Design a protein around this ligand. Structure first.
Ligand SMILES: CCOc1ncc2c(n1)CCN(C(=O)c1cc(C(C)C)c(O)cc1O)C2
Ligand SMILES: CCOc1ncc2c(n1)CCN(C(=O)c1cc(C(C)C)c(O)cc1O)C2
Lengths: 210, 209
C-alpha cells in the first residue's frame, strides 16, 4: 500500500525555486547530504552513550557514496539514527520548518542558494541535480520505509520491501540527464575534499563495476 | 554543592593552545557561539515536529546577545534544546573527542585557529577573549545547571540557583582586561554582520547604559 501526501505549500515553493532558479554551483547538494548524514550519525552515537543496545542494529558508524552509471544514480548511505514513519512524514514534506520562509527571505536580502544549510532545509538542494529522489530509512523504533518524489507537489511513502538496512538512511538520487558528472570518481572526490566541516566518520567512495 | 571535574586530556590540551598561542583574529569567537546556538535551536525544532509538547518549556526560538560593561561580561543566550548534567560532564566531550584531536593535528599542519568550528569544538574559542566562562543550561528532561571553567585543566558543575530559563543555554563570557571592545555596540554589530549575516533564527543585540 502506497500513501500519497501533498508537500506543505511553502515547501512546494522552495522546491520550485530550487528547480527553476538559474544557479551553476549545483555541487553543494553533496555537501548538504553529508551534513545530514553527519547529524544522524552524531545522534545514534550520542544515544548509544547511555544505552549501548541501540547499536545492536549495527555498530559501524560511516558514510558510503555509491555511483551507478547504468542506473544513472548516486546513492548516499549512512548508519545514523534513521527516521521513524512519523519522522519521515513530519520532517520531510508535510510541515514547513521556520527556516524555509527564512531562507527564501534571505534570498531576497542577498544570499546565495549555497547557504540553504544554515536554515535546516539543505535536503531539497538534491533537486539541483536529481529528477527523482528516493529515500529509504530504518529507525530502531520502526519499520523500514521508502519516501519518493519527483517534485510536482507530492511525495509517496510506502513500506520498503528491498534489502533491509539494519539502521540508517539511504538517499538515491535519480540524476538529470545533464548531471552525470556526479557519477564520476574524480568529480566526487573533488567535491568531498572541498567539504568545509571535518567529517568525524569514515567516508568511503565505492568504485563502479564497469 | 559544587562538583569539580578533570577535562579530557585532549580538551585540556586544546584549551592551553587557545590561551597561549599568539592570534590577533579573536573576533571569530562570536561566530562560533552563534553557530552553536543555531545548532541547538535546530535540535529542539526538529524534535518538536513529531512531539509538539517539547516546546511547552518555551515556543520562541531565538538568540540574545547581552553585553554588560559593569560586570565586563558578554552573554549569549538561546532557547535551544539545552544540555543535561550528563551532557555537561561527559557526553558532549566524548562526541567532540575526534574533532578535538583532528583540529590540533591540523594546526600543526599549519592551519588557522579560525577553522576551530569546522571540527565541532568552536565553543573553546571563547578562551580567546575570556579568562572565565560560565555556562547555564536547562534541558527538558533535567534540572538547570551551571558549568564553569577558568581553564587550568578542570571545570565545575553545580545545580543553578538563579533565574529559571525555561529551556536553553546561556554562555557568560568574563572578558580579559584587554578584550573590552567586544562590549561595544558598534563592534558587536560589525562582527555579526561580518560572520553571521544569515543565521536561521532571530538575533537581538541588547544595548546598554
Ligand atoms: C538535528 C539533529 O537531530 C537529528 N535527529 C535525527 C535525524 C537527523 N537529525 C538528521 C536526519 N536524519 C536522517 O536519518 C537523514 C535524513 C536525510 C535527508 C533529510 C533525507 C539524509 O540525507 C541523511 C540522513 O541520515 C535523522
Ligand atoms: C546530539 C548530542 O550533541 C548535542 N546535543 C545537544 C546540544 C549540543 N550537542 C550542542 C549545543 N547545545 C547547547 O545547549 C549549547 C552549547 C554551547 C557550547 C558547547 C557550550 C553553546 O555555546 C550554545 C548552546 O545552545 C545542545
Amino acid at each position: 500500500e502506497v500513501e500519497t501526501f501533498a508537500f506543505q505549500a511553502e515547501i512546494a515553493q522552495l522546491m520550485s525555486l530550487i528547480i527553476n532558479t538559474f544557479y551553476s554551483n549545483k555541487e553543494i547538494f553533496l555537501r548538504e547530504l553529508i551534513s545530514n548524514s553527519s547529524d544522524a550519525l552524531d545522534k545514534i552515537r550520542y544515544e548509544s552513550l547511555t544505552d549501548p543496545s541501540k547499536l545492536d542494529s549495527g555498530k559501524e558508524l560511516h558514510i558510503n557514496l555509491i555511483p551507478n552509471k547504468q542506473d544513472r544514480t548516486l546513492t548516499i548511505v549512512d548508519t545514523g539514527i534513521g527516521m521513524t514513519k512519523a519522522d519521515l512524514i513530519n520532517n520531510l514534506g508535510t510541515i514547513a520548518k521556520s527556516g524555509t520562509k527564512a531562507f527564501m527571505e534571505a534570498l531576497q536580502a542577498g544570499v546565495d542558494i549555497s547557504m540553504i544549510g544554515q536554515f535546516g532545509v539543505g535536503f531539497y538542494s538534491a533537486y539541483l541535480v536529481a529528477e527523482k529522489v528516493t529515500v529509504i530509512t530504518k529507525h530502531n523504533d520502526d519499520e523500514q520505509y521508502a519516501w519518493e518524489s519527483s517534485a510536482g507537489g507530492s511525495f509517496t511513502v510506502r513500506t520498503d520491501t528491498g534489502e533491509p538496512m539494519g539502521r540508517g538512511t539511504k538517499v538515491i538520487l535519480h540524476l538529470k540527464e545533464d548531471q552525470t558528472e556526479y557519477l564520476e570518481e574524480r568529480r566526487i572526490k573533488e567535491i568531498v575534499k572541498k567539504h568545509s566541516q571535518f567529517i568525524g566518520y569514515p567516508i568511503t567512495l565505492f568504485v563502479e563495476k564497469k
